[PDB]
Design a binder for this molecule. Structure first.
Ligand SMILES: O=C([O-])C(=O)[O-]
Length: 8
């Protein structure tokens, strides 16, 4: 999904 200030 997403993490911190990035999403994948
Ligand atoms: O958890 C995740 O998928 C990431 O940090 O990209």
């Amino acid at each position: 999904x997403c993490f911190x200030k990035t999403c994948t």
